[PDB]
Symmetry: C2
Subunit: 138 residues, 2 copies
């Protein structure tokens, strides 16, 4: 077959949650598996699946939300960002209405005001990603 190996591909989303025209903040997850801690919702892209499809799918599974992707925010690939293996993440910014419901790799799902995100409890490199988001560094 094709004998080429590359980092694993995953996708995460910065979900801006809304209750009508009222901004509530973003949705973060309490990881249920190995890298335990607070983080953005996201998952691995399946072979044969478009990155945007994996993001929507991954959001349904973990947050129960129907997320409309708004913008490609960035691609994070520092070798040591994911303890499980070398994982490169395509990060999106999206929007959603409704009530979050945990599931899958997520043992807990919750909304955080952008001014109330406990940056130091974030796992992976999500603190850097979120800081980039808050600063408009994209």
């Amino acid at each position: 077959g094709f004998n080429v190996k590359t980092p694993l591909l995953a996708t995460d989303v910065i979900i801006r949650l809304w209750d009508g025209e009222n901004f509530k903040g973003i949705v973060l997850i309490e990881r249920k598996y190995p890298p335990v801690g607070l983080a953005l919702p996201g998952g691995f892209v399946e072979v044969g699946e478009r990155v945007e499809e994996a993001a929507a799918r991954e959001m349904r599974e973990e947050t129960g939300l129907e997320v409309r992707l708004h913008k490609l925010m960035g691609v994070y690939s520092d070798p040591e960002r994911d303890p499980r293996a070398h994982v490169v993440s395509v990060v999106w910014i999206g929007d959603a209405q409704g009530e979050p419901k945990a599931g899958s790799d997520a043992k807990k799902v919750k909304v955080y005001r952008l001014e109330e995100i406990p940056l130091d409890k974030l796992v992976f490199d999500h603190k850097k990603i979120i800081l980039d988001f808050l600063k408009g560094n994209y």
Copy 2:
């Protein structure tokens, strides 16, 4: 050994070539190996390597240019974009000065004015990518 399979990760660059304040167009590659045709310079991302580093390495290797990445332009993941395997590409827009030159006769370098690119000769989904660039769809 982390039994997770995802698409392969690659990165390509749209190189705006300059001769001083004079814009010359884009740097493309004429592939001799399948897919045979015109293509953006780029390659697979290696495990343990950052995407920006893979792009920089591929540019020096394929065009012999010292390219300064300028903008994350997009991520392309259509399942059929690459015939070899499901490959997802992180596309950047960069700039370079100087004269390019192939690192192998299998990859001849050519500079094209944006108005004279033979879109019909582009392989992979690079026609889609180049048009997105020209239309500013990013």
